[PDB]
Amino acid sequence: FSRLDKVEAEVQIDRLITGRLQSLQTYVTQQLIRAAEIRASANLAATKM
């Protein structure tokens, strides 16, 4: 914002926010996979117990 007009800089900040959002999505997908694996392991442990 500090150096350019709004009309053009808003496109760049939209690019940045989209990239950050996609990175967050990737993180959450990895978390889902890990949680599913951990749930399987927890069920196995419950059966063991």
Place this chain on the structure above:
Amino acid sequence: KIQDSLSSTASALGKLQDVVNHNAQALNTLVKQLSSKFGAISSVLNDI
């Protein structure tokens, strides 16, 4: 006794209700999610 025990409360059938609610909620989110602009002029193609 089990017959009346099933219908006495309402949380006994939680899992199947959760499944169907999850499916419906996913569908509704998907159909509503197309109203966004994604930093464009409008969400309707024909006017664009």
